[PDB]
Amino acid sequence: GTKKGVSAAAFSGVTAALGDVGARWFYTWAADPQGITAPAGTEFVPMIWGRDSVTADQLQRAKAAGSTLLAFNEPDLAGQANMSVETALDLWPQLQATGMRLGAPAVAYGGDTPGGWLDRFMSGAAARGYRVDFIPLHWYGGDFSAAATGQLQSYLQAVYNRYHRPIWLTEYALTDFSGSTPRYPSAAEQADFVSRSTAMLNGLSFVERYAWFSLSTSTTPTGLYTGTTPNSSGVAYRAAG
Numbered sequence: 001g002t003k004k005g006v007s008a009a010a011f012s013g014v015t016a017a018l019g020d021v022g023a024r025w026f027y028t029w030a031a032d033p034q035g036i037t038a039p040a041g042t043e044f045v046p047m048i049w050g051r052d053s054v055t056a057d058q059l060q061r062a063k064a065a066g067s068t069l070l071a072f073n074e075p076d077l078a079g080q081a082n083m084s085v086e087t088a089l090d091l092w093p094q095l096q097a098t099g100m101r102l103g104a105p106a107v108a109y110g111g112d113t114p115g116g117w118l119d120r121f122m123s124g125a126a127a128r129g130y131r132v133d134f135i136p137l138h139w140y141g142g143d144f145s146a147a148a149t150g151q152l153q154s155y156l157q158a159v160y161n162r163y164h165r166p167i168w169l170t171e172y173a174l175t176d177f178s179g180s181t182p183r184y185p186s187a188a189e190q191a192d193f194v195s196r197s198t199a200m201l202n203g204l205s206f207v208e209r210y211a212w213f214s215l216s217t218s219t220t221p222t223g224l225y226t227g228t229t230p231n232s233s234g235v236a237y238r239a240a241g
């Protein structure tokens with residue numbers, strides 16, 4: 001398959017972990033690999049994370065580093081890119097002018113909601129004659145049962161049905177963020193979800209790429225690897241197509 005990728009940072013053993021897990025692509029939330037040496041066959045995808053990365057220098061660096069460009073990360077959240085739709089649209093021509101295959105900003109929430117951030121962005125892009133080649137999404141499930149895969153699927157399908165752009169899933173895991181501090185599944189629940197979700201994602205033609213959040217436990221408790229050693233979730237992700 002071409003779909004399976006990961007987000008990553010340059011922790012000790014990252015090059016080995018990327019190859020071990022079989023990542024076809026990766027990204028780093030930045031315009032370059034952030035110190036990661038990718039294994040052969042693992043494609044880096046640059047990102048323009050927020051307003052401060054919309055510079056001629058960053059855009060040229062991104063275009064030198066890869067072929068596909070991801071736009072702003074969670075502009076809908078104050079603790080992430082924290083950007084209005086208007087600001088994102090006004091910056092958009094600079095990203096579009098790279099000529100790269102271009103992903104929408106990845107909203108944290110509400111991608112299928114009429115009048116939400118993504119909907120207003122896509123509507124304004126269409127009105128302005130802008131190009132948006134694909135839509136990357138984020139999804140963190142708070143229901144840790146076998147039902148989680150179908151919940152994720154329904155969100156992806158809703159966003160595809162609304163805008164008819166191919167979908168990337170650039171962050172996903174089981175994590176309940178409803179509370180003052182994140183709540184996580186058991187290791188077994190997580191590994192089962194990795195298996196079921198990747199099988200689902202591999203069968204949806206409109207999902208081009210997906211990336212578990214994240215490769216390393218140094219990034220998040222939902223990490224797949226500690227150093228070069230996969231946990232049961234990393235083993236399940238490695239086994240996925």
Ligand code: NA
Pocket residue numbers: 062063064065066067
């Ligand atoms: Na390029």
